[PDB]
Amino acid sequence: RPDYDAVLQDIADYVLDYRIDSTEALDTARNCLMDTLGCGLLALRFPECTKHLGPLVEGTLVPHGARVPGTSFRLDPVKAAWDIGCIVRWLDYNDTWLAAEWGHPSDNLGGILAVADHLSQKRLANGEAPLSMRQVLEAMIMAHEIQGVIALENSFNRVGLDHVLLVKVASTAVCAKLMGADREQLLAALSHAFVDGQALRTYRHAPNAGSRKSWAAGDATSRGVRLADIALRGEMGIPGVLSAPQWGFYDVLFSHTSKDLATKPEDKRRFSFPQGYGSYVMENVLFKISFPAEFHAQTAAEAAVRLHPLVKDRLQRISRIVITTHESAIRIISKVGPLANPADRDHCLQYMTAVPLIFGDLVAEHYEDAFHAAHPLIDRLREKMEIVEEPRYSREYLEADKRSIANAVEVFFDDGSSTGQVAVEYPLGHRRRRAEGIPLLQEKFKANLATRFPPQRCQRIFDLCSHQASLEATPVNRFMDLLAI
Amino acid sequence: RPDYDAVLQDIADYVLDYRIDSTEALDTARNCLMDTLGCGLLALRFPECTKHLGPLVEGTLVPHGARVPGTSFRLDPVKAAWDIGCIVRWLDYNDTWLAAEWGHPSDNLGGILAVADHLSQKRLANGEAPLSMRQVLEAMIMAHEIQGVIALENSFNRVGLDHVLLVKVASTAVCAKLMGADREQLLAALSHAFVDGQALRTYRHAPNAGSRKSWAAGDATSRGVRLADIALRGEMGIPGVLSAPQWGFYDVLFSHTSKDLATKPEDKRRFSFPQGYGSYVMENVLFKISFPAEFHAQTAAEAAVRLHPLVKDRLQRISRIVITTHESAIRIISKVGPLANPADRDHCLQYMTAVPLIFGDLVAEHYEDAFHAAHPLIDRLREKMEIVEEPRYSREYLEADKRSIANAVEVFFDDGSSTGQVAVEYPLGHRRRRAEGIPLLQEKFKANLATRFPPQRCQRIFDLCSHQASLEATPVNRFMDLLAI
């Protein structure tokens, strides 16, 4: 019987022994928590979301049960994790990680919060200390790292699998540690997350797309709670889950590309890593805090809004519009021709640049059919647009020290005049612009709070969340009381 | 947005519209119910099994909760289906279907009983009539049919996936029916079973095998209950889940053999069927009622107990033992050389032929290293055992009018004489020996009941299960009452 594959061991040793010493990671983890909870609160206005929430059997009584913020539910950790994971991801406004695999590592808050809430209450009733919110922040940082770092070079999308398996893996490990797993239990849990069935991503792709794109994450972090619980009950592990021949994850599920059914070269049938596990992912995570736009177009629309006062007058006089960009924006979001659905304008670099040049703003209303086929000047600006890749933009898109998403917009006029090239290399949600965006993230948190809580409670919630040292010192159960109903 | 894939529509129209009036199907389903429940009761003596049972949070109260037979547990139907499916499969004594895919369709009783128990109670508490056991028998027949008919020609271990996904699909189907689903809800439920993740089978193969081989099924019927309930909450479906290019089940998971990572010829990249759905599987299902041995050797062990009085005192005169068998037994349980643990001996045709040849019997005690060593004659005879494939046996193993599992044994002596050749082509648990097998199935139920209930309760349970018409008219909640504690 082999020992555990090393990928599982390296996660295990990280989760158990790594000491987070980055105060920036702790800071932005705190802001992630606020941002993520606000997203969840807002989703409670959407009955296609809320129809999933609550106990499986009405009237069920769970001692010391975990709370779902914004509700009165008290559930076992496994269903509370499902519910929280569900609401914080539902509207696709939560944090993002863009790499070989795309993902939303804040989704892991479902498992973290539900397990830590339940366990503080249980320990309190036994005369022991509760867990502190400091420990949920550390759990988030590690969940981010595990998911984000595996995603740096490993794409599940290309083998036809949803990215939600990283949520399941990361949640299993971080929830196993919150439950007090030792090394052998932790490794056992990780092997069950990899032997587990992994969801297809069929529900993310037309003509079969659907609202499971919104709850796959919560269902994954929930399953991570359940796999940790199983390992804590003492279940044995599967040591060669990844490497085993014929039967292992690598041969069965990571050895063929979905587009063509081709076998991968042997050197590519494993996970590969350019770095270890630290606190890189939380430090460099993207927040959605400006224009509602695909991230590759975020800096393009910011330049177009600034360019507005030099094009607002005589938009007809516009002759040439040049959008200099990075290559992935050209691959994923550059589109020519008719924009039929609101999903097509969502994914058109020219559409999302024409609207803020004309109106000085890009809001979610500007994608509805009645708007596009009402202002033909959008299509007029759109045919005038030339998109040129900048080598430097595309390379520093990949450079680990930079991780740019850079766009530059220059509008020319029929007389030969131009405005000059407004270049924006980093979107407002980026690490480089934290001093700028963190106030926007906070006003977005205050607005999300106000859709669920009265002003008295809103201020009390914000004040605690604004105070790092007081937040960290707060028991998880006392933090969760603030969030109920 | 396409219609649902034809496979899903065929399953749904069968589940909603097919009327079950087959007298033999309903009689063997009632014997199937006894045998399955008695198997699960026996598992309660095994802490590795019982460590998985009960609520996730100790002390949880579930109004109208489903019961787990042989325990005092009262759970939601998802956890209840997990525990029932876990316990009835744990010891690998429950019924079997051998085809392109092997399986144990009785695993679906976990989802069927938990849903039908909870729903009867909840309906009683709102003044509605409860479900009857006739409905659980019909749900078993349908679940047996969906799983066992897909397994006729579609092998999932050749693509490196556990067969348990057929438990999830069938349990999803019949539980959605019991919950009252209409056609659009049942289609959506079915589509979520296929888009779901499908476990690897690493845990069934050395050197990684472990006890998840015992609870994978309970985990799969539990997941089926959960997805059925997701569909009844109105969640939209995924219509081209199987046939979608690139993202569908066929392209991602059914397109490669895991031996060699070789792509299948195009025409075989989908499920094939030799017939439609009816009541075929349950009528031809296999019960384990004779010796405790791997199915491919039950007629071998039988042919040896017959040969035992003719050799019982000439053991040192045996010079050649010829075992004429079928192609699957040779491949799966023909093992020369040392046998480390009981699992080896459990899956070694020569062992399960030699022991009965010597001691006129075969029980679990014989798979003990202590018993093995105590008698060196086992290996003397194992080394004299010539295994030969009969082409007929292998063909009739496959033909749908027969489903033979055949073993002929012949014993030769140093002086050149021999016994005859004793051929047993059908094991006792086969449809062709229903008459003789049913006495043994009932005695096996009676013994297993007696490891858990005192004699008068054992009598009430046996007497009720004995009478087809009485059992069928019994409310599910009252049947489950008898099985508590």
Side-chain angles (χ1 to χ4, degrees), chain B residues 293-306:
Chain B
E294 212 273 349
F295 242 113
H296 297 84
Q298 294 220 348
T299 59
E302 217 194 310
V305 162
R306 265 47 151 199

Side-chain angles (χ1 to χ4, degrees), chain B residues 214-275:
Chain B
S214 277
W215 56 262
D219 188 63
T221 185
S222 169
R223 177 64 163 176
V225 175
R226 176 67 167 125
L227 299 174
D229 168 274
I230 286 184
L232 269 291
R233 287 158 181 265
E235 179 71 20
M236 68 184 85
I238 302 164
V241 61
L242 297 181
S243 73
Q246 196 173 0
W247 313 116
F249 180 99
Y250 282 160
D251 275 3
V252 177
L253 307 159
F254 209 55
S255 45
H256 308 102
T257 40
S258 82
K259 251 208 162 313
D260 33 48
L261 324 168
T263 305
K264 292 182 179 175
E266 203 276 358
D267 66 314
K268 303 286 212 210
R269 299 208 273 270
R270 57 174 174 100
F271 306 144
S272 61
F273 294 92
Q275 58 199 24

Side-chain angles (χ1 to χ4, degrees), chain A residues 1-2 48 50-65 75-79 82-83 90 118 122 157-161 191-203 205-212 215 219 223 226-227 229-230 233-241 244-253 255-259 261-263 269, chain B residues 1-2 48 50-65 75-79 82-83 90 118 157-161 191-203 205-212 215 219 223 226-227 229-230 233-242 244 246-249 251-253 255-264 269:
Chain A
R1 196 176 193 81
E48 298 290 13
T50 57
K51 72 171 191 295
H52 288 293
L53 312 180
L56 297 167
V57 184
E58 190 219 324
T60 286
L61 255 284
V62 189
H64 303 317
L75 314 170
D76 65 71
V78 170
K79 187 45 160 65
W82 208 106
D83 281 16
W90 186 269
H118 176 58
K122 237 180 62 182
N157 155 301
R158 282 157 174 253
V159 305
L161 300 183
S191 58
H192 280 283
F194 281 109
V195 89
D196 231 42
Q198 316 301 343
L200 308 183
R201 50 182 287 129
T202 326
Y203 47 76
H205 291 290
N208 299 287
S211 49
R212 187 162 174 163
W215 55 261
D219 184 68
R223 180 61 166 184
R226 177 75 169 119
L227 293 181
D229 171 83
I230 283 184
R233 279 159 192 272
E235 182 75 12
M236 54 173 83
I238 311 153
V241 61
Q246 183 170 2
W247 307 120
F249 185 93
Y250 280 156
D251 276 354
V252 181
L253 294 177
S255 79
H256 294 92
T257 271
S258 181
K259 227 163 177 87
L261 321 187
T263 313
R269 303 172 200 173
Chain B
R1 291 172 190 163
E48 294 291 353
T50 69
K51 77 173 182 288
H52 285 270
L53 315 182
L56 301 163
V57 184
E58 182 251 300
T60 291
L61 175 280
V62 189
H64 309 132
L75 308 186
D76 63 280
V78 170
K79 191 44 167 63
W82 210 104
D83 293 354
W90 188 266
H118 170 59
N157 80 290
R158 285 169 71 268
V159 313
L161 301 178
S191 82
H192 283 277
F194 282 109
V195 80
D196 229 38
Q198 319 301 343
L200 304 164
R201 38 186 297 148
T202 322
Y203 43 79
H205 294 285
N208 287 311
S211 48
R212 177 158 177 165
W215 56 262
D219 188 63
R223 177 64 163 176
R226 176 67 167 125
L227 299 174
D229 168 274
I230 286 184
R233 287 158 181 265
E235 179 71 20
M236 68 184 85
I238 302 164
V241 61
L242 297 181
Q246 196 173 0
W247 313 116
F249 180 99
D251 275 3
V252 177
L253 307 159
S255 45
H256 308 102
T257 40
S258 82
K259 251 208 162 313
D260 33 48
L261 324 168
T263 305
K264 292 182 179 175
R269 299 208 273 270

Side-chain angles (χ1 to χ4, degrees), chain B residues 461-472:
Chain B
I461 295 165
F462 184 89
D463 284 356
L464 170 58
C465 296
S466 299
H467 296 102
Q468 187 82 24
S470 308
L471 170 60
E472 286 189 3

